[PDB]
Design an enzyme around this catalytic site. Structure first.
Site, PDB file in Angstrom:
ATOM      1  N   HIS A 213      -3.892   5.080   6.193  1.00  0.00           N
ATOM      2  CA  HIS A 213      -3.123   4.161   7.044  1.00  0.00           C
ATOM      3  C   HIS A 213      -2.449   4.971   8.143  1.00  0.00           C
ATOM      4  O   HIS A 213      -2.497   4.607   9.327  1.00  0.00           O
ATOM      5  CB  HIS A 213      -2.091   3.364   6.267  1.00  0.00           C
ATOM      6  CG  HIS A 213      -1.463   2.287   7.089  1.00  0.00           C
ATOM      7  ND1 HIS A 213      -0.195   2.393   7.614  1.00  0.00           N
ATOM      8  CD2 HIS A 213      -1.964   1.117   7.544  1.00  0.00           C
ATOM      9  CE1 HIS A 213       0.071   1.314   8.336  1.00  0.00           C
ATOM     10  NE2 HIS A 213      -0.981   0.528   8.304  1.00  0.00           N
ATOM     11  N   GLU A 351       0.150  -6.838  18.466  1.00  0.00           N
ATOM     12  CA  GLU A 351       0.628  -5.598  17.903  1.00  0.00           C
ATOM     13  C   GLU A 351       2.069  -5.283  18.195  1.00  0.00           C
ATOM     14  O   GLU A 351       2.782  -5.014  17.294  1.00  0.00           O
ATOM     15  CB  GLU A 351      -0.315  -4.401  18.077  1.00  0.00           C
ATOM     16  CG  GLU A 351       0.150  -3.156  17.311  1.00  0.00           C
ATOM     17  CD  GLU A 351      -0.843  -1.995  17.304  1.00  0.00           C
ATOM     18  OE1 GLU A 351      -1.775  -2.013  18.071  1.00  0.00           O
ATOM     19  OE2 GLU A 351      -0.676  -1.080  16.530  1.00  0.00           O
ATOM     20  N   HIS A 366       4.298  -8.007  15.929  1.00  0.00           N
ATOM     21  CA  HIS A 366       4.000  -7.277  14.693  1.00  0.00           C
ATOM     22  C   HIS A 366       4.925  -6.040  14.542  1.00  0.00           C
ATOM     23  O   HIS A 366       5.512  -5.812  13.468  1.00  0.00           O
ATOM     24  CB  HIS A 366       2.493  -6.904  14.595  1.00  0.00           C
ATOM     25  CG  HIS A 366       2.217  -5.687  13.752  1.00  0.00           C
ATOM     26  ND1 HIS A 366       2.333  -4.399  14.241  1.00  0.00           N
ATOM     27  CD2 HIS A 366       1.832  -5.563  12.455  1.00  0.00           C
ATOM     28  CE1 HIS A 366       2.048  -3.536  13.275  1.00  0.00           C
ATOM     29  NE2 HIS A 366       1.765  -4.216  12.171  1.00  0.00           N
ATOM     30  N   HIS A 370       8.201  -5.286  11.480  1.00  0.00           N
ATOM     31  CA  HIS A 370       8.476  -4.067  10.777  1.00  0.00           C
ATOM     32  C   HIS A 370       9.899  -3.643  10.925  1.00  0.00           C
ATOM     33  O   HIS A 370      10.550  -3.374   9.962  1.00  0.00           O
ATOM     34  CB  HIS A 370       7.569  -2.959  11.238  1.00  0.00           C
ATOM     35  CG  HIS A 370       6.196  -2.994  10.645  1.00  0.00           C
ATOM     36  ND1 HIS A 370       5.792  -2.125   9.669  1.00  0.00           N
ATOM     37  CD2 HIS A 370       5.120  -3.755  10.927  1.00  0.00           C
ATOM     38  CE1 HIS A 370       4.542  -2.365   9.354  1.00  0.00           C
ATOM     39  NE2 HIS A 370       4.107  -3.348  10.110  1.00  0.00           N
ATOM     40  N   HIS A 406       1.585  -8.659   6.914  1.00  0.00           N
ATOM     41  CA  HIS A 406       0.215  -8.637   7.376  1.00  0.00           C
ATOM     42  C   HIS A 406      -0.598  -9.858   7.006  1.00  0.00           C
ATOM     43  O   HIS A 406      -1.553 -10.177   7.717  1.00  0.00           O
ATOM     44  CB  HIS A 406      -0.491  -7.327   6.977  1.00  0.00           C
ATOM     45  CG  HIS A 406      -0.274  -6.261   7.991  1.00  0.00           C
ATOM     46  ND1 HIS A 406      -0.962  -6.232   9.183  1.00  0.00           N
ATOM     47  CD2 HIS A 406       0.635  -5.266   8.054  1.00  0.00           C
ATOM     48  CE1 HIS A 406      -0.508  -5.235   9.916  1.00  0.00           C
ATOM     49  NE2 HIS A 406       0.456  -4.631   9.249  1.00  0.00           N
TER      50      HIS A 406
HETATM   51 CU   LIG Z   1      -1.606  -0.626   9.942  1.00  0.00          CU
HETATM   52 CU   LIG Z   2       2.099  -3.764  10.119  1.00  0.00          CU
END
Ligand SMILES: [Cu+2]
Ligand SMILES: [Cu+2]
Ligand SMILES: [Cu+2]
Ligand SMILES: [Cu+2]
Lengths: 669, 656
Positions: A213, A351, A366, A370, A406
């Protein structure tokens, strides 16, 4: 030997350059230009003393810097702070430092090394490590430098904090010439099965998966000053696909553990039931990564030092705008003109990346999800605390809430894929491969049954010595337990009556039944199909037998590439197969031989795992939409059996069976 | 020698004791079979390795090894606290083993065996209790706990820096590592205004040392059964809460609200920013708005619902209403004038000398446990306790004071049922105190910030030897002298007990207070015996001689006591108004006749292994109320008492 000097700049990130670096005790010869206020009056003397010691193997003489690198933004991050690109101020610092390192004249490697030495000495160690790696990956002269294994350099991002006092004891008590016994990492350290979410810990906390990741985001950053770094081929679509497949894989595991498909986090004012106490401590900052108790909710962020000044109202506005783009099929540009929405663009809008067509309007949903989620304990910096694990790409996958975030992002992409005005179901001519008839598909295992995959548990060692600041040298191993499978192969038989002389083999698996133990609708099962391999083969006229080893998967990288025995990008081979159960769980193996004429891409070290990672300096090597044929709803089949009747497709029931035994890795020291 | 050799067990507590000990490079001759399992195969090699260049080798006597199965149940890398039920069992066993060794050489031998096996915090604690009680280790002082485990007392970032200094600065001068004074919360946190009190190393040490010397459970009831320890439990914590309240009022905060509804949210979170080398993990925070939740932690042998605290609380209020407690035999024991508060202290804490522990429970201690585990009440997350969970760290947490204001409120319900002191009880015929004051700008006290150092080198494991100083900033006051004027009108010499207190002039809403209110804010400054001639007398008493505090350099064992630098409240920039109060009572009615004691700091700590040296109630003359709730301190005053208006002036300046 200059390349050895570059590799050494990774070593012991929390140590100054005053003392030696590496197993081999190598000194960087410091000069006045390389001092810091901390060592302004004693630094050179101390450096002289360390290099005069008996065991020092060699000393690196650095080229004088004709001009001192300038870091006005990046110098503001303290050395004992934690670094994250989800913080807008940290992204700006990273772009500044990368720009400096990228600007050094091509092939002037002594100048480059002195510039990097200067950067290391004067910057936060996590920031330095990230920027240096991005530069090494993207410059044309650093091809021969090995980026040091991230788990060896920052092992605290991967381990149980409790390993470290034991590691320091082992290095101090046992001389470096005598092997230290591995420190055993418990299976249950973040929780026990009293916590239902703990059943997935083996997967969520897997070092190979978290390393992948981390490396994916390294190859595909959302920001840079050089757009060329960000604008790699189809990165927006790949952002969608990679995360969709991560969610598909996690969902397969959830169903192997008596749990349901992960629930998207879409009602953003509600409390969050999932707690997580990661047990990780930063060796850079001395701080525990703040945990999350059950029942917290998002709160407006007011952290001006981080560059975070954003409300839930803002997030809801951005989301309305994105949903409107999907509903109309058009994105609105800054000049108010429109453009037709596609999956690549939507990936960049979501994103968000610097490739978003309208960042003012669509925001960066996104990335901010986070942020919000990582700061619920301290949204306005009242408590002088930093971000939770969900805000670091190397640690984020450990947290159950990562998957809820996600799941929602994937649901957004699926709403686009499911909307007929945006994306049309494949026609027969897009799915067929005239003259190619798959007659059987099987998996076979040495020592195994036909159509059975066998999983088990393995203990493997990682060396944490390079990341253990101020310890004596010599290996110190942590021994961790991970999923694995017995090697297997696919055997696909096909009769070719027609003219095709090449085909792409695409292999996916999915659980046969859902949470209710009932057969799936294809509209749901398409999102549960996990891609296992994708590879071009020749076909002859008449009968063909295609054999493919599990070790050849174009999804994965071998153990010895994930760990020390685009190098780091790739799903770990030991996580290729879902866990299954002791009793065995029925899966469906789907194989397709697609029309190469529509697959082909025409274009002119380590294993390259192109499915998730694409290829360095090349177009993504498959012309089909990522996730084909399952990226979008079928217009003619409501179940996989009916979908699979097509001549060029095959379907076979298999069983994944866990053998609940633990074996040592044969590659262990 | 063997006696003095014990002190090596307080050096580098995480390093195995077959390594070199102290700054002098000494080694123990650890026998091969004492080596931990993981090192047994290398014991020859290691012995040689650490014996090389050692200045002295200390022989280890062959003994019959004790059974350590019970105390070995605590993981080597866990936190230790007496609040935790299973930790009481394990510590009692190990103390019992240390106490039972026939001689000091045998004790040295068993200590070396245990050091290599037992949780270092539990080992430290039990060895310290044994050293304080064994007849053959008298006059041995315990090395300061803050230099053994300095991570309990300062920001974890300190140790980063300290480990760097120790390893990198291998020659020439070293600068002290700076200990940040403000670190747990921002300016935007009201509670942060009194962090200098909560996080003070001297205050936390006093708390550790008090509980060490007056444990509520131990290996033998005689270790617990110290003079009036129940009453001292009440008083020492009543004074903590008094002191903290003054401090709050100097900083624009209201007085602390008790946590008397155990179901309510705890609005004030606390992020301790501490790290433990022994546990190899950071201390968990408590997020704002957290609640007490039902406990079921098998590993801790604690299982108890929040509901239970309500049950125990109600049982107390009922006992106080009846002025009598239920006994196991189904009859009742009066709460009598002399011993009532002592009984209540032991009932409440609770301790093993509680009259009826089965019924009355363990209310105060479980409060710590509930508060400490709000984040992981059933161990599903495998988390350790927050700072409330350990007496070395609990005072750091704003919640400590809320809990103790609740506990003190209960004790105070009892105190206010007692008959007011009559004039005759209070008076000392023949003795009139004409005035009290502070010498100098008279009747003015000055406070400021001061930087002092602590040594980290003994407690920083797996680093080079040598001095690693850290520099911390703490409150400080200028020293001063009391002047008391007294007329002895009797014709002969008298002995008095001089008792000195101060209180705020006004409350948190800036209003004058009744006696019944203000009395709870009377903080003790001194208690001493004084000879009194015919007729006029001028008593001068130095601030440095206070019966409440211990000196800086202090930190026989003589470590309990309020830190001297915290003797007086911070005050304010404009000058904080207080009343200085003196009473001289009749020493004949106060004294206790009894026999080489450290008699430092007797006000909050008593005298180790002697009777508390004052027959009056702790906090006399302020522990009881007046009948009239509108009555003021001026209405209280009798001829042997005097008051003076004083100012405490804070300078926001820092000295070394
Ligand atoms: Cu990722
Ligand atoms: Cu993410
Ligand atoms: Cu206490
Ligand atoms: Cu308490």
């Amino acid at each position: 030997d200059i390349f050895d000097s570059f590799e050494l700049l990774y070593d012991r990130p929390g140590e100054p350059m005053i003392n030696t670096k590496g197993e081999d005790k190598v000194l960087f010869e410091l000069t006045e230009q390389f001092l810091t206020p901390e060592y302004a009056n004693n630094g050179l003397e101390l450096n002289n003393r360390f290099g005069d010691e008996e065991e020092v193997s060699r000393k690196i003489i650095l080229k004088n810097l004709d001009k001192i690198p300038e870091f006005p933004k990046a110098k503001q991050l303290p050395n004992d702070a934690d670094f994250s690109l989800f913080l807008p101020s940290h992204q700006e610092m990273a772009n500044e430092v990368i720009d400096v390192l990228m600007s050094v004249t091509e092939n002037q490697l002594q100048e480059l090394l002195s510039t990097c030495v200067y950067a290391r000495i004067n910057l936060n160690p996590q920031l330095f490590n990230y920027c240096y790696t991005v530069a090494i990956m993207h410059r044309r002269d650093t091809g021969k430098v090995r980026v040091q294994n991230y788990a060896e350099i920052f092992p605290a991002k991967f381990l149980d904090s409790q390993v470290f006092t034991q590691a320091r004891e082992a290095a101090a008590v046992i001389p470096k010439t005598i092997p230290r016994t591995p420190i055993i990492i418990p299976r249950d350290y973040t929780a026990t099965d009293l916590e239902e979410e703990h059943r997935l810990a083996y997967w969520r906390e897997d070092l190979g998966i978290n390393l992948h990741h981390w490396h994916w985001h390294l190859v595909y950053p959302f920001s840079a000053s050089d757009e060329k770094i960000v604008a790699k081929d189809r990165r927006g679509e790949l952002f969608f696909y990679m995360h969709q497949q991560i969610i598909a894989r996690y969902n397969c595991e959830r169903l192997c553990n008596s749990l349901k498909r992960v629930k998207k986090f879409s009602d953003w004012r509600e409390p969050i039931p999932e707690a997580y106490y990661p047990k990780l401590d930063s060796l850079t900052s001395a701080r525990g990564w703040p945990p999350r108790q059950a029942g917290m909710r998002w709160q407006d962020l007011k952290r001006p030092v981080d560059g975070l000044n954003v409300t839930i109202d803002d997030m809801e506005r951005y989301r309305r705008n994105i949903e409107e783009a999907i509903a109309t099929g058009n994105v609105i540009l800054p000049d108010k003109s429109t453009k037709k929405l596609d999956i690549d663009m939507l990936g960049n809008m979501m994103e968000a990346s610097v490739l978003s067509p309208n960042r003012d309007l669509y925001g960066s949903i996104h990335n901010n999800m986070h942020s919000f989620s990582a700061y619920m304990h301290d949204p306005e910096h009242r408590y002088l605390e930093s971000f939770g694990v969900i805000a670091d790409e190397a640690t984020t996958m450990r947290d159950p809430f990562f998957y809820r975030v996600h799941a929602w992002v994937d649901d957004i992409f699926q709403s686009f894929k499911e909307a007929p005005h945006n994306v049309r179901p494949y026609s027969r001519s897009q799915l067929e491969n005239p003259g190619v008839q798959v007659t059987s598909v099987a998996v076979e295992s040495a020592g195994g049954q036909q159509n059975v995959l066998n999983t088990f548990w393995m203990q493997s060692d990682v060396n944490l010595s390079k990341g253990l600041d101020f310890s004596d040298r010599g290996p110190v191993y942590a021994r961790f337990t991970h999923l694995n499978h017995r090697p297997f192969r696919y055997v696909i038989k096909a009769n070719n009556t027609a003219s095709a002389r090449r085909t792409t083999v695409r292999i996916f698996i999915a659980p046969k039944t859902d949470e209710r133990n009932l057969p799936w609708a294809l509209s749901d099962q398409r999102k549960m199909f996990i891609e296992m391999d994708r590879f071009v083969v020749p076909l002859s006229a008449g009968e063909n037998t295609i054999t493919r080893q599990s070790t050849e998967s174009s999804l994965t990288i071998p153990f010895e590439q994930t760990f020390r025995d685009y190098c780091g990008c790739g799903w770990p081979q030991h996580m290729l197969v879902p866990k299954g159960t002791v009793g065995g769980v029925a899966y469906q193996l789907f194989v397709m031989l697609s029309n190469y004429e529509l697959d082909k891409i025409e274009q002119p070290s380590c294993v390259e795992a192109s499915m998730f990672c694409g290829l360095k300096d090349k177009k993504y090597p498959d012309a089909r939409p990522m996730g084909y044929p399952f990226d979008r709803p079928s217009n003619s089949a409501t179940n996989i059996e009916d979908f699979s009747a097509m001549s060029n497709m095959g379907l076979q029931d298999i069983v994944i069976k866990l053998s609940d035994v633990t074996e040592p890795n044969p590659r262990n020291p | 020698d063997a006696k003095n050799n014990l002190l090596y067990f307080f050096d580098r507590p995480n390093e195995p004791c077959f390594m070199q000990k102290g700054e002098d490079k000494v080694v123990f001759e650890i026998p091969d079979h004492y080596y931990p399992d993981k090192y047994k195969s290398l014991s020859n090699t290691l012995s040689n390795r650490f014996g090389n260049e050692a200045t002295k080798r200390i022989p280890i006597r062959n003994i019959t090894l004790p059974n350590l199965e019970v105390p070995m149940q605590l993981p080597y890398n866990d936190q230790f606290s007496l609040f935790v039920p299973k930790h009481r069992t394990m510590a009692a066993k190990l103390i019992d083993i240390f106490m039972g060794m026939r001689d000091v050489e045998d004790l040295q031998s068993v200590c070396s065996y245990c050091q290599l096996r037992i949780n270092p915090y539990m080992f430290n604690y039990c060895l310290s209790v044994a050293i304080l009680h064994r007849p053959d280790t008298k006059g041995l002082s315990i090395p300061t706990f803050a230099e053994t485990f300095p991570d309990k007392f300062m920001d974890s970032k300190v140790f980063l820096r300290a480990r760097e200094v120790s390893n990198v600065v291998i020659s020439g001068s070293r600068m002290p590592v700076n200990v940040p004074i403000n670190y747990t919360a921002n300016t935007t946190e009201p509670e942060q205004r009194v962090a200098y009190f909560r996080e003070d190393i001297g205050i936390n040490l006093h708390h550790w040392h008090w509980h060490l010397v007056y444990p509520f459970d131990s290996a033998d009831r005689s270790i617990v059964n110290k003079d009036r320890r129940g009453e001292l439990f009440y008083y020492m914590h009543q004074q903590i809460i008094g002191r903290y309240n003054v401090e709050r009022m100097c900083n624009g905060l209201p007085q602390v609200k008790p946590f008397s509804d155990f179901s309510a949210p705890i609005e004030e979170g606390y992020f301790p920013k501490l790290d433990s080398q022994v546990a190899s993990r950071t201390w968990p925070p408590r997020f704002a708005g957290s609640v007490f939740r039902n406990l079921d932690r098998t590993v801790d042998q604690v299982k108890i619902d929040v509901r239970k605290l309500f049950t125990w609380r109600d049982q107390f209020l009922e006992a106080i209403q009846k002025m009598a407690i239920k006994m196991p035999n189904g009859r009742e024991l009066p709460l009598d004038e002399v011993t009532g508060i002592d009984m209540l202290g032991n009932l409440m804490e609770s301790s093993i000398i509680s009259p009826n522990r089965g019924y009355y429970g363990d209310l105060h201690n479980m409060g710590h446990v509930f508060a400490a585990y709000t984040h992981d009440p059933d161990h599903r997350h495998l988390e350790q306790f927050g700072v409330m969970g350990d007496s070395a760290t609990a005072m750091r947490d704003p919640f400590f004071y809320r809990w103790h204001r609740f506990v003190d409120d209960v004790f105070n319900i009892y105190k206010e049922k007692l008959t007011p002191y009559t004039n005759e009880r209070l008076d000392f015929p023949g003795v009139r105190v004409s005035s009290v004051g502070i010498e100098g700008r008279p009747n003015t006290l000055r406070t400021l910030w001061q930087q002092s150092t602590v040594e980290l080198g003994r407690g920083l494991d797996f680093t080079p030897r040598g001095s690693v100083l850290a520099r911390f900033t703490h409150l400080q006051h200028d020293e001063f002298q009391y002047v008391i004027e007294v007329n002895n009108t009797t014709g002969g010499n008298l002995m008095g007990t001089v008792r000195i207190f101060m209180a705020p002039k006004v409350d948190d809403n800036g209003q004058p207070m009744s006696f019944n209110k203000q009395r709870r804010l009377m903080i003790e400054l001194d208690k001493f015996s004084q000879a009194l001639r015919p007729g006029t007398n001028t008593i001068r008493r130095r601030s440095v001689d206070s019966s409440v505090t211990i000196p800086y350099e202090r930190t026989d064992f003589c470590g309990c006591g309020w830190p001297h630098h915290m003797l007086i409240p911070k005050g304010t920039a404009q000058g904080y108004p207080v009343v200085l109060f003196v009473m001289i009572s009749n020493w004949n009615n106060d004294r206790i006749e009894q026999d080489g004691s450290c008699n430092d700091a007797a006000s909050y700590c008593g005298i180790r292994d002697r009777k508390y040296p004052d027959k009056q109630a702790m906090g006399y003359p302020f522990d009881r109320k007046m009948a009239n709730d509108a009555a003021t301190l001026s209405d209280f005053l009798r001829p042997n008492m005097a008051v003076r208006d004083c100012s405490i002036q804070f300078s926001d300046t820092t000295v070394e």
